[PDB]
Amino acid sequence: TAFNNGPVCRGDAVQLNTTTINNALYEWYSDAALTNLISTQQNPTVANITTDSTFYLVVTVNGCPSSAVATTVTLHPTPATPNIP
Amino acid sequence: TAFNNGPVCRGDAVQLNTTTINNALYEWYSDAALTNLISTQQNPTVANITTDSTFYLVVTVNGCPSSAVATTVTLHPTPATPNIP
Incomplete structure (x- = not known):
């Protein structure tokens, strides 16, 4: 299995x-x-x-590769432009 | 068995x-x-x-998974609004 960090x-x-x-x-x-x-x-x-x-992660053990495991890295929603006079 | 940290x-x-x-x-x-x-x-x-x-924690040893162990994470009671003039 494979995991990412949280939204980046x-x-x-x-x-x-x-x-x-x-x-x-x-x-x-x-x-x-x-x-x-x-x-x-x-x-x-x-x-x-x-x-x-x-x-995609592939792990090979004993000469036998696994199927690929996908992970998705999310991007954190961009913050709004600040309010200035 | 499984344990959490204290109230968070x-x-x-x-x-x-x-x-x-x-x-x-x-x-x-x-x-x-x-x-x-x-x-x-x-x-x-x-x-x-x-x-x-x-x-829930499941541990597999020797190809034999355990039953699930639940833990509960408590949340620390929210502090009161400060007193201001």
């Missing part, structure tokens, strides 16, 4: 998280097609999330 | 806790039906507890 500010970074499995290989992808690898860390951080986006 | 302020977060079991899988759910998974960490933190709420 437009210029901030999101730490992605998953379950620790002994001697597992983790692969995080930027796309459903699983062609663009971002990271192999268990808990990678993805910078500059300026839009809602998804990440 | 309305906008704060609560760390939930359980017993360490070697190579156990932990699953925390937001509901009794066990359909909405929140986290797989041993000691996850749940943000924005604005109301009394419960969490």
Whole structure:
């Protein structure tokens, strides 16, 4: 399974998280097609999330890769322009 | 078994806790039906507890899941409006 941090500010970074499995290989992808690898860390951080986006996790254990797990990173609604004289 | 932190302020977060079991899988759910998974960490933190709420823990060891354990997070009674001239 995979989890994100809560909704993120437009210029901030999101730490992605998953379950620790002994001697597992983790692969995080930027796309459903699983062609663009971002990271192999268990808990990678993805910078500059300026839009809602998804990440896909594949975990390989014993030489047997899992299906991909999608997570969605939400962006926090932009605050209103302040009131000045 | 599962434990919470003490009563929490309305906008704060609560760390939930359980017993360490070697190579156990932990699953925390937001509901009794066990359909909405929140986290797989041993000691996850749940943000924005604005109301009394419960969490359910299921632990799987040796491929054998436990029954769910409920915990209740209490919210600290809101302080009174200050006295001003």
